[PDB]
Structure 1
Amino acid sequence: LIVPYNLPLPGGVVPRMLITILGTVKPNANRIALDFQRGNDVAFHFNPRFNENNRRVIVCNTKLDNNWGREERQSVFPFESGKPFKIQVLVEPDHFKVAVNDAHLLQYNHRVKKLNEISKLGISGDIDLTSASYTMI
């Protein structure tokens, strides 16, 4: 698939929706981003950074009216330059739950509460994208 890729989420997200993203990280990757969008707002930004001051970190945040909020940072970093990955995002009633390569990574409490209005997922960054899909579990 071509990156950046936009995956419509018809009628928005709902609990029990599972989004699965398969791809490969490019060699010498700098960043990956998943952006769950509510119009111009970003309800959930998931941003692995491969070199922030010589550290690897995942930054999560929300953008409202063009302003970024308080960052949530995770130092557990399961991505590897050059290697295939699987990201799964499970929507639960009170948070997005993220697993990478079948291991739980993090949860992100819902800041944007109109879940039905979060109707697009943007996938961008230094990856080759193989598949992006959703199902109900």
Structure 2
Amino acid sequence: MPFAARLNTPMGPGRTVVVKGEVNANAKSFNVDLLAGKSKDIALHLNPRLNIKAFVRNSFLQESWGEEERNITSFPFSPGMYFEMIIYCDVREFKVAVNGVHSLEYKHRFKELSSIDTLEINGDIHLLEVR
């Protein structure tokens, strides 16, 4: 990696993106982005930060970053360990779970969900599976 691939089916109410992998032993950060490849908009930007232990997420829309959402109930990533991330897309929001526990919801900023057709993953991670 960096991993950058086409979603074989674009996002919509009820669509899923599953990330399985291993956060590096000496990791500091990694990113999984849900892109609208046509305008280069990042509708969903999940950025777990191992060093400060914060799950950051934002949207990069019209060449400009929005307001940041950090609110978590627990930090589900730990260096040297395997994680599974399920990203579920609902009508009004994304729902993200990590390792069988609910992590966060994220209201849709990029409203035209069918235009989200790209997945990008980079950072201090070892990618096992994208589904």
| TM tier relative to shorter chain | over 0.9
Q: 1:65 maps to which residue?
A: 62
Q: 1:128 maps to which residue?
A: 126
Whether the 8 Å contact between 1:30 and 1:126 is mirrored in structure 2 is yes
How far apart, CA to CA, are the structure 1 residues paired with 2:34 and 2:5?
10
Whether the 8 Å contact between 1:23 and 1:86 is mirrored in structure 2 is yes
Q: 1:105 maps to which residue?
A: 103
How far apart, CA to CA, are the structure 1 residues paired with 2:19 and 2:86?
6
The Cα of 1:6 is off from its aligned counterpart by: 1.7
Identity of aligned residues (%): 38
Q: Secondary structure at the match of 2:114?
A: helix
How far apart, CA to CA, are the structure 2 residues paired with 1:132 and 1:117?
19
Q: 1:10 maps to which residue?
A: 8
Partner deviation per Cα, 1:88-136 (whole Å, 9 max, x = no partner)? 0011111111000010000000000010101101011111111001xxx
Query: In the alignment, residue 46 of structure 2 is paired with which amino acid?
Result: F
- Corresponding pairs, count: 128
Q: Secondary structure at the match of 2:53?
A: strand
Gaps of 5+ in 2: none
The structure with more strand, counted as a fraction of residues: 1
Q: Secondary structure at the match of 2:87?
A: strand
Q: 1:90 maps to which residue?
A: 88
Q: 1:48 maps to which residue?
A: 48
Moved over 2 A (4+): none
Q: 2:17 maps to which residue?
A: 19
Alignment RMSD (CA, Å): 1.2
Whether the 8 Å contact between 1:11 and 1:117 is mirrored in structure 2 is no
Gaps of 5+ in 1: none
Please say which of residues 24-33 and 72-81 is displaced more in the overlay: 72-81
The Cα of 1:10 is off from its aligned counterpart by: 3.4
Q: Secondary structure at the match of 2:77?
A: coil
Query: What's the TM-score, normalizing by structure 1?
Result: 0.88
